Amino acid sequence: MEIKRFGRIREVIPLPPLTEIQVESYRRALQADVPPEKRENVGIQAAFRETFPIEEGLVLDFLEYRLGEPPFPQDECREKDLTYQAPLYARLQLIHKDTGLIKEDEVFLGHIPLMTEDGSFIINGADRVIVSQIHRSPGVYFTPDPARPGRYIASIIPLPKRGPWIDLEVEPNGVVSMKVNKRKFPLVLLLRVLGYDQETLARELGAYGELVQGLMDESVFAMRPEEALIRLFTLLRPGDPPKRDKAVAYVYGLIADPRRYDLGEAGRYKAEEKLGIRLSGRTLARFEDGEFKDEVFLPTLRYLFALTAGVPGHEVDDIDHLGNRRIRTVGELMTDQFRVGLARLARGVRERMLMGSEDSLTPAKLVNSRPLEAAIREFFSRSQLSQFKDETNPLSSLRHKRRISALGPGGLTRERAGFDVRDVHRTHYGRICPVETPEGANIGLITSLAAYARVDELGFIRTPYRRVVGGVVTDEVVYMTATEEDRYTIAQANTPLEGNRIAAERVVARRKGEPVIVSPEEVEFMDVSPKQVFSVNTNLIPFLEHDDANRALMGSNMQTQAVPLIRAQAPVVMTGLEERVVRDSLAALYAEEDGEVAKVDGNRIVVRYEDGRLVEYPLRRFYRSNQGTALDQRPRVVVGQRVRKGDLLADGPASENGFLALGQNVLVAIMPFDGYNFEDAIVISEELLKRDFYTSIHIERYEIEARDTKLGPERITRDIPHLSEAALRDLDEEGVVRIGAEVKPGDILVGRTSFKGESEPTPEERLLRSIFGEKARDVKDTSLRVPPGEGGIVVRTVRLRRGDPGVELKPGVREVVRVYVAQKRKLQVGDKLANRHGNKGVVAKILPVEDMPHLPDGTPVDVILNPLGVPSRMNLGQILETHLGLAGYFLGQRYISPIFDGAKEPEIKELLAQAFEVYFGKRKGEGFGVDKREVEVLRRAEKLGLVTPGKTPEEQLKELFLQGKVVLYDGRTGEPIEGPIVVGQMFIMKLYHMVEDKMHARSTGPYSLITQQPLGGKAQFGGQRFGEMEVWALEAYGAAHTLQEMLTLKSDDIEGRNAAYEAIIKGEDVPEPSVPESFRVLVKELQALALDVQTLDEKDNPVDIFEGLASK
Amino acid sequence: PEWMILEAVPVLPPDLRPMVQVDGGRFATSDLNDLYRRLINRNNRLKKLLAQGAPEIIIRNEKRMLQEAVDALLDNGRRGAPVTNPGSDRPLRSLTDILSGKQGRFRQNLLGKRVDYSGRSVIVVGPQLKLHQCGLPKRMALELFKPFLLKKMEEKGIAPNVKAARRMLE
């Protein structure tokens, strides 16, 4: 079919690689492709260089490192629950200073996780994503003192876990104070430690009259750098002996030590640019030729005094400015934890160096790799920034990798997070999407990288612009930080151009974010595209300019939740970004070079290229993702087909011919229907189920272990006590359900027997035993069964055993068995549907086709959406989408309508006219005139002022059709809807929230250990929480017995719940409640606090709730 | 008043601070055990240091550590650094922690509880329903009313008895 695209704006550059933020970061951190001698001082190499050399006389030094090949490929790691990783070797040499003896060896430090091609990790078989962090960039800042106006705070901030924040403040008593580790002390003391003479400080700070006088203290200058140093040491360390070398050690470690104190490279640069100086190292001072020399302190003090005085060219700082906020990507975070683990390894090394034999010590004996391994593993497992990858659809992964978080280690906590940091700063333009953020507690804290946005080597987000010289717009593209962007007047991307020249007398631009109308002579730069303002998700919403931001947020977020459909289709109205997303996400398989297709299979595509070489591509088939969505690739080519470079070989999940397919294109009518669409509920046609629209494959994995116990071994077998052959029907010889069998709740996936816990049979059991003459078996049925509400076809079985080749399990485990079950999910009532404009709803009704509103030609609508959802929501994009959707229905074409450079009403009207001719003229030729019902509806619409009086029925019907409205017949009556109804094609997705996953119920089930209350959650077969507020509801109703049941009979009252169940199965009314067990737990826990809690009667006599069991 | 000093520190019943074998045969246990173990180790070492006639600095250190141990047991992190398990920054959960807070005994287990005969699901509009009615999915009802259903199954020929009915609904 034909794809017609709108808009005049020609994008100069394409979108950058969208996963580059992960990929280039980690690649930069590892430097695996760089030969060791050519490596830079950045990355894990940096950590090695900071840790080593290790001294104190033995000395352990670092030569180089290397990363080996991964012991296992990614797939094998996924199946065996391994981690995709490379062995890390480090060449070290021990040198005894006195002896001169040098022992050199390459030691094995364990493994490091490798990033996959798509920018994710495989940790213990599960795919994870390390999310970029946003934080305050290190440097020197000047902020208004909130209490006293006219006074300011100078804060010196290093990298996280790189040493203390230092504050500088002019006190009301006139003296300048320094704050370190919450210690306020006169700065002049440290100034003296740096070896500053009063004359130098006087000539330097003299320009500011009142302040430098407050700086002057003669008791300090009467001292010496040594005496001042020891004084400061006594100030920072009360009780600690003021030894000279110890004071030098402490102050050096606090300020001048590069290993203990680190400003980033960015902190270095920003400090330099702000204070107008040049930094030697990344510290605030140095230890040179035996004494200390100042770097940051004096320039900071100078600037602070200058700002306080009012001296021009001195301003406070906007800490929310994106020039002052940087990003820590995967490489930096991983490198950080690497540095920590390395430090621990070093501590161990010094230990062994002191303790070990002096004659023979190898680096192998000195180095224990364990702490480092632990640090890395901990980072990739228990870190908040290490998240379970969202694979629901390819766009979910792509978007997840592009996420930015203000939370995590060294970041904000949601308590410390106020409105300011959650705001959309003007500087977010082109950098951080203003639209896509969570609605709830994380709002503004979790954000998304803009489409054209890039993170520089310093960690600042940069957006592209275009050089404009003399009103001529070049193709030269410049990526600036926010600080650089602030220096220019930047024209909007929609400013009218003839050729490369701007033609308008007046152009709309930004100067430091401020909108301004300027002449073309004033334009320095121009935007690349409206696309650059938003995220990859937001860029997928057509007619975005017609949607309120609040619903754009919802559409964005919800696209992430779209489930891959077997029949999945690209939107009828696209934004033009649909293919790049598929490509960058590595969802689809593409042709490497120009060539010819040799072989096409469900499992394989073999291509012969220009090189004459035969390259075979295996297709991933019905693989289970993290969210249980089926990820499978289907061949889109055929045998003998010629393919050029970058051609599509195969469609992955949610991809139709290389275009992103997140849902279906359905025919909607926008009308109320019998209350079934009330309050956002949605009505659909059974025709959608008939043709398998919104049907999705989901695969669930079940797992069981058979282990060695002290009572005898558990074992996986087909022999299950007290079970018929009907139950073992689908079980194979070994006890595992056979591939292809259909399983329902209660069915056995894997047979397992376990030796019984030691028990003396109760006399009832003994008598019954003798009566039936059957020996009591010593094993019981532990078999893994299909949980309630689940089931499907078994598509896989994996069996690993101890004693099997290449297989070693965790200690005590004899064998592990997994069973993969696939299910085909049709759309059903309660499933969540949504469009890209933020219109979401749960399917409340599925009508048979004959009940559906239909067009006069007999065509029933697919979906009925309530118009009441439009006005308060203010997302009109869906309406336009529908209108155009109508046109493309009858013209049989799809559209690209770029955001903010769109399809416009008149164009849609033209298309609708052509479409109308297609929709009507056909009828007129078919020998049918205008219908009576059509006449009535035309009269009605004529009263509404929709059509002009005096025109022919055809003319009026066309007048309506241009408004996107058509006559519609009630399927139940045959009489038409009194008004003409808006009908057209809309792109609707089936979200990951499905009632099949959420429906849960329990009578009784497992209880908690200590509290004896029901467990929570569906997976545990748990009870719903009746919380304080539910209790308040029952209290407010004055329903005492319902409440008391909640508190006792239905939860933690043991005797009560038992007696209640028995009473109900007997048919008796439920017995009176007893003491809830958790109250006894409270009493006994208060007793453990040495408080005596006594339940008393009206006689003030003790009452025993433990019934003598607790009393001697 | 002197009862505000502890000569004999009470010990919670073990079931309230369980040592339990989880599914895989591995053990999981409450922090209170580790706190109590610190306490008992320090106390015992104190008695042995006393009996052996130790110098005053040592006994002083030991007593201080004993007081801090008791502190950690009763309210952890109340005074001084919170006691943590080896290789973790996580504070151990003491009796005070157990009692108070949103996760505390009162608010979590006392003023509110998880309950039986309860369920949840997605909601859908009811337009045909009368005001006093709600649509309830069949299976949810089968589970929620389950004992009643066993009873009624026995009242008819549907099952010989309750246990047969339940095994039938399995």
Binding site: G239, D240, P241 | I57, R60, N61, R64, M65, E68, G80
Partner: peptide
């Protein structure tokens, strides 16, 4: 305040 520091002081006495 810091028990280790305190003890190291008491040790630093003798």
């Amino acid at each position: 305040s810091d028990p280790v520091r305190q003890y190291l002081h008491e040790i630093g006495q003798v």
